[PDB]
Coordinates of C-alpha atoms in Angstrom, one line a residue:
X1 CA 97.2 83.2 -24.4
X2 CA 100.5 82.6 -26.6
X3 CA 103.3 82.8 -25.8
X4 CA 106.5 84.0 -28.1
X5 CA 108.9 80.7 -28.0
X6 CA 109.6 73.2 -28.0
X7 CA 109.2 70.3 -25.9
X8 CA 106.6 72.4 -23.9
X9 CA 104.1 72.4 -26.3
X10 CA 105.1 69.3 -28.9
X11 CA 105.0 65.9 -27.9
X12 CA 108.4 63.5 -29.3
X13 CA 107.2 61.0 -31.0
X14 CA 108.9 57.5 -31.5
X15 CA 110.2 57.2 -34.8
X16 CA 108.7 53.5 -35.0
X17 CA 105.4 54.8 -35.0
X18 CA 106.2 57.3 -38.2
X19 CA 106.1 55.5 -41.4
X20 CA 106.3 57.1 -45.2
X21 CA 104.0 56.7 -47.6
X22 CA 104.9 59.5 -50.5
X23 CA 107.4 61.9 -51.3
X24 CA 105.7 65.4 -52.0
X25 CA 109.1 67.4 -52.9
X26 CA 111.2 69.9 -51.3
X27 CA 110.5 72.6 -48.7
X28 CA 112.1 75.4 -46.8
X29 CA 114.5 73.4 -44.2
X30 CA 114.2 69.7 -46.1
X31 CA 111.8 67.6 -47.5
X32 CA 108.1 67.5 -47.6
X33 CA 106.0 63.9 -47.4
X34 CA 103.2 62.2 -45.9
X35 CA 102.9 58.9 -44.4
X36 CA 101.0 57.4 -41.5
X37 CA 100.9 57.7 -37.7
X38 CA 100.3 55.0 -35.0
X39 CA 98.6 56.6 -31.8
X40 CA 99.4 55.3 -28.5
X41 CA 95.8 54.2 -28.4
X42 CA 97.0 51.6 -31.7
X43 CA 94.9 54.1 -34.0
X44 CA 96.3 55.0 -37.0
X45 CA 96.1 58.4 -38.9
X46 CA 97.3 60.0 -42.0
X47 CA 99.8 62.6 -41.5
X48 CA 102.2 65.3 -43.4
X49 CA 105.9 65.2 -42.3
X50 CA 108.6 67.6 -42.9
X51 CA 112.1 66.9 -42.4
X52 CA 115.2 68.8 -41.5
X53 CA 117.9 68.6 -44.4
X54 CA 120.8 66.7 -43.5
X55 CA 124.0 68.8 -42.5
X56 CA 121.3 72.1 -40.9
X57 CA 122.5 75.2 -39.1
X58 CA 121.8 75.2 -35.6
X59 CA 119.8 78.7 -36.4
X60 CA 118.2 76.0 -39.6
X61 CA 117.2 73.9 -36.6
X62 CA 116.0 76.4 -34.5
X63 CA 113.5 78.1 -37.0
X64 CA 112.5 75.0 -37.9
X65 CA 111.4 73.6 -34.6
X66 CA 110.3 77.4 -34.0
X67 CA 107.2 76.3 -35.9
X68 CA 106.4 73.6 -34.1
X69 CA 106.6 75.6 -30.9
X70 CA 104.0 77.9 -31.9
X71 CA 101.5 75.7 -33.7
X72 CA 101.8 73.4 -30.8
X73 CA 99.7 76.1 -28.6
X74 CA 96.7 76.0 -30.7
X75 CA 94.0 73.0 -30.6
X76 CA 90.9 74.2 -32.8
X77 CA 89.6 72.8 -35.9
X78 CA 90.1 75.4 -38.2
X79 CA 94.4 75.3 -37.4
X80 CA 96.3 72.9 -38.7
X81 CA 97.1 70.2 -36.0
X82 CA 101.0 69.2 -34.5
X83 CA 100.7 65.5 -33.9
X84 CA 104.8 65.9 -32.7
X85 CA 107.6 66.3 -33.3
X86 CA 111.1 63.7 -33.8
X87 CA 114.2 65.3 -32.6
X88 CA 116.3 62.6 -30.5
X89 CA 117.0 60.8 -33.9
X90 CA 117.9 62.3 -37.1
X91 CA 116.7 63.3 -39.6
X92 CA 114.4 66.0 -37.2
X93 CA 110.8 66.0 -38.3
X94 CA 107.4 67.6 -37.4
X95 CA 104.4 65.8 -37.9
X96 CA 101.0 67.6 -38.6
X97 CA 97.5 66.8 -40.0
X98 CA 97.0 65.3 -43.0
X99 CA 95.3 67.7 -45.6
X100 CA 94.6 65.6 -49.0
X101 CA 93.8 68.4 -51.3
X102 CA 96.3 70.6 -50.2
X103 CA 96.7 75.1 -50.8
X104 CA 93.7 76.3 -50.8
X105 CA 94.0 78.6 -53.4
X106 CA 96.1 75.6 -56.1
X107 CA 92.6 74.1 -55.3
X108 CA 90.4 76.6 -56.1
X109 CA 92.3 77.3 -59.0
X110 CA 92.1 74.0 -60.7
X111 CA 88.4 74.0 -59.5
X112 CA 87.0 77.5 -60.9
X113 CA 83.4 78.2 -60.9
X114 CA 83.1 74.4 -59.7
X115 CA 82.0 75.2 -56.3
X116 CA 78.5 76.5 -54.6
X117 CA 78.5 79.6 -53.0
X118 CA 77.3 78.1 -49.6
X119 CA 80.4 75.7 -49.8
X120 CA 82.6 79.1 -50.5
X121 CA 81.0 80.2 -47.9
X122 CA 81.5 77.0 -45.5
X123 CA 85.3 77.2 -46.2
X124 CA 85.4 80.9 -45.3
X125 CA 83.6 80.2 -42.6
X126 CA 86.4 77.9 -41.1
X127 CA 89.0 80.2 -42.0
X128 CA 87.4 83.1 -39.9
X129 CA 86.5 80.2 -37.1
X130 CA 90.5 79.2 -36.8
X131 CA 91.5 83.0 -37.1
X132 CA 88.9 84.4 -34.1
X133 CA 90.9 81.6 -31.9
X134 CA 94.5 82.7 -33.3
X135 CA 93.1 86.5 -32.4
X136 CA 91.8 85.5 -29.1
X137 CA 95.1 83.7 -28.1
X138 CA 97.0 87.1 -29.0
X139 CA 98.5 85.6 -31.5
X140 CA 98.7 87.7 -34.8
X141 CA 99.9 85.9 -38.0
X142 CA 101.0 88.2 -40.2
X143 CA 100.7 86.0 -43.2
X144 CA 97.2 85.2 -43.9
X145 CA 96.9 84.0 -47.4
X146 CA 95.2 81.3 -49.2
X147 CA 98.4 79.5 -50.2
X148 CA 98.9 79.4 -46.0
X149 CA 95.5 77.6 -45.7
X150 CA 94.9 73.9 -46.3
X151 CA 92.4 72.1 -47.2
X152 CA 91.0 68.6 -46.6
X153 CA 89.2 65.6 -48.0
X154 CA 85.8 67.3 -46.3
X155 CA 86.7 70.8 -48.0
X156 CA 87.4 71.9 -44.2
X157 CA 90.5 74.6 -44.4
X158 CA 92.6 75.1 -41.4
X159 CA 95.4 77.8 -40.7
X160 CA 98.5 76.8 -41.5
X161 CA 102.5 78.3 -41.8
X162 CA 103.4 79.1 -38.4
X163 CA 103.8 90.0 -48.1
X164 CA 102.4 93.6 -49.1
X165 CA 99.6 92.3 -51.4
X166 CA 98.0 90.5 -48.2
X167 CA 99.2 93.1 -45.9
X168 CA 97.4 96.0 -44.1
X169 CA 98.6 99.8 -45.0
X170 CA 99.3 100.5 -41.6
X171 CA 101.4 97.0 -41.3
X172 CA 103.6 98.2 -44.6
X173 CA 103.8 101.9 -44.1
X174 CA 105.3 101.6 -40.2
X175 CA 105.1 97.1 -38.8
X176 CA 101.8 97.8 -36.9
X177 CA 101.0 94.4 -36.7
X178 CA 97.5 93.8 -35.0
X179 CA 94.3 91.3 -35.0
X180 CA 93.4 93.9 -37.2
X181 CA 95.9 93.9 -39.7
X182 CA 95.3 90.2 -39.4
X183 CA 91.3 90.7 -40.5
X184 CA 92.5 93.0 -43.2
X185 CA 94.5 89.7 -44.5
X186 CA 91.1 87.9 -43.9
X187 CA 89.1 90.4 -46.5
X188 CA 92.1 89.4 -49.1
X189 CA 91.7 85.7 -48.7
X190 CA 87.9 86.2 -48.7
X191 CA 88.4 87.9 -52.7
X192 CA 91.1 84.9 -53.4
X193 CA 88.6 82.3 -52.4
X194 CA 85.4 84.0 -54.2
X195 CA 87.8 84.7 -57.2
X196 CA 88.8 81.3 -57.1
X197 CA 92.3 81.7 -56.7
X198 CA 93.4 84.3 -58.7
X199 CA 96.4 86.6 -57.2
X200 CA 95.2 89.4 -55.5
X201 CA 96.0 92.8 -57.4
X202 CA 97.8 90.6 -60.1
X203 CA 101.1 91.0 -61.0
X204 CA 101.1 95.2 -60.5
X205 CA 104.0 96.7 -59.5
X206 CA 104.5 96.6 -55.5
X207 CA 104.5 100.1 -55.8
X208 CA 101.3 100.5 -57.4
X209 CA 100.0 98.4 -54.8
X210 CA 100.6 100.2 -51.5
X211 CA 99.7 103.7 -53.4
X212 CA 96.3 102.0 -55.0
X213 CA 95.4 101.1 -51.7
X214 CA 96.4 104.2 -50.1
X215 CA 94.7 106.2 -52.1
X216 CA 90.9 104.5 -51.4
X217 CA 91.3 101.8 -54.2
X218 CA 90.2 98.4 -53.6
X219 CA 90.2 94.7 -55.3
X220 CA 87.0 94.8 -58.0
X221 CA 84.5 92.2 -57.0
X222 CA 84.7 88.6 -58.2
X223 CA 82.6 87.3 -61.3
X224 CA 79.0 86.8 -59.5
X225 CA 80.2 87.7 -56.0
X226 CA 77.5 88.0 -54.0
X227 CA 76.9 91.8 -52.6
X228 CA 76.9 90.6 -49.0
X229 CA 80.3 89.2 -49.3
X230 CA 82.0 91.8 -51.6
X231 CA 80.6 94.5 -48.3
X232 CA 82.5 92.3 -46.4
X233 CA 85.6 92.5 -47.8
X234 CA 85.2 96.7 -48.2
X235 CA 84.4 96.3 -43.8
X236 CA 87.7 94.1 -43.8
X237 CA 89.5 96.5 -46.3
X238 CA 88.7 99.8 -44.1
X239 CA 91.2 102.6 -44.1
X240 CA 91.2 103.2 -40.1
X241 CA 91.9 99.4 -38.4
X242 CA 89.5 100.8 -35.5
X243 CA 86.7 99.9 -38.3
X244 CA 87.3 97.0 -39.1
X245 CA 85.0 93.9 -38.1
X246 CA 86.7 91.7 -35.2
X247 CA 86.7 88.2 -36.1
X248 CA 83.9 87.0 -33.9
X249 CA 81.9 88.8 -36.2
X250 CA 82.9 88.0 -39.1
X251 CA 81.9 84.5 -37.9
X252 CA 78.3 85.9 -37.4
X253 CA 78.1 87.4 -40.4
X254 CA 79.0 84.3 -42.4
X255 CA 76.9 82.0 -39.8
X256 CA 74.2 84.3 -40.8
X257 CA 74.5 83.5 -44.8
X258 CA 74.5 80.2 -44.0
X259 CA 71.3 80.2 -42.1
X260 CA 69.7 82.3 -44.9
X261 CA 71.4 81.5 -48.1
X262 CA 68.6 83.4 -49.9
X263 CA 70.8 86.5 -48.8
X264 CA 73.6 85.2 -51.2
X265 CA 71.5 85.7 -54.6
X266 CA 71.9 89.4 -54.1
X267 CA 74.8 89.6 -56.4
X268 CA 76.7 93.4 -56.3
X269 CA 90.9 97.0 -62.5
X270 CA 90.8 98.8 -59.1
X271 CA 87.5 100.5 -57.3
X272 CA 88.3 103.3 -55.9
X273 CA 86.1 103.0 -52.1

């Protein structure tokens, strides 16, 4: 189980063992790198580092560490790991896994039509692997996206950052925030991946958005989208949340179109569903 929030779940590491390789830019609460990590074991690892700007608010502080708090309670391959955090020397810094080709959707974007459909597929499947842990920890996320998914040298994507276009109706029309508004996330992420990145629902007005939905209209299916996948995302997109697959199958049903991948050569502006 999770539970709502530093030192409990992140270990301090020693500065000495941190060293920085590359400047990535700016983020949120400071700046963004990578670098490299000695293990107490004398192993050394490739890591992402954020820092805390100089001169932060103690609230700055606070939701900064806040995400290492809550990523530090989850150890599964499909979530982005906390190797530690640095706070009794300045500047404060968490420490995570290493992920050399970044937000999964700026990849798929500079990739499009590049990939097979089993290794969509394989990258969903991760996804929905990380997410049935998150759900099964009680632990809803509330920001499921493709930008908040990372990627690796392998092409293994991981959870990571611990609005209405990825957001359930029920979570926009009165916060009722569930696994389920969680899966409904999952169905958009599942178009951005097979779309390759594109934004989901474009640039329509926010508006247009929550009425389209409302009203039984869903996301068209992606150029050559297999029908199995594109049902899917309808079963993740259903009106009533009570409908809705769990996450555990979700996993089953993409387990399944990898163990037959003949299934994926059935192949199937807003559909109104």
């Amino acid at each position: 189980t999770f539970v709502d929030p530093v030192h409990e779940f992140a270990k301090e590491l020693d500065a000495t063992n941190i060293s920085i390789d590359k400047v990535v830019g700016a983020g949120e609460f400071g700046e963004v790198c990578s670098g490299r990590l000695k293990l107490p074991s004398k192993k050394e690892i490739s890591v992402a580092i954020k820092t805390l700007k100089v001169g932060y608010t103690e609230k700055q502080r606070r939701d900064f560490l806040g995400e290492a708090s809550i990523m530090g309670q989850f150890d599964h391959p499909n979530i982005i790991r906390l190797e530690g955090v640095v706070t009794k020397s300045k500047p404060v810094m968490i420490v995570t896994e290493y992920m050399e080709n970044g937000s999964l959707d700026s990849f798929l974007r500079k990739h499009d039509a590049q990939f097979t459909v089993i290794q969509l597929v394989g990258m969903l499947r991760g996804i929905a692997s990380g997410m049935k842990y998150l759900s099964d920890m009680g632990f809803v996320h509330r920001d499921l996206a493709a930008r908040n998914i990372l990627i690796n040298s392998n092409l293994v994507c991981k959870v990571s950052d611990f609005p209405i276009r990825w957001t359930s109706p029920e979570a926009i029309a009165y916060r009722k925030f569930t696994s389920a508004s969680d899966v409904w996330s999952y169905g958009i992420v599942l178009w951005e991946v097979m779309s390759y990145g594109e934004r989901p629902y474009w640039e329509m007005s926010n508006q247009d958005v929550i009425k389209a939905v409302d009203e039984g209209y869903r996301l068209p299916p992606p150029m050559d989208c297999p029908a199995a996948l594109y049902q899917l995302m309808l079963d993740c997109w259903q009106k009533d949340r009570n409908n809705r697959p769990k996450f555990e199958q979700i996993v089953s049903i993409l387990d399944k179109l990898i163990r037959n991948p003949g299934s994926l050569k059935i192949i199937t502006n807003l559909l109104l569903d």
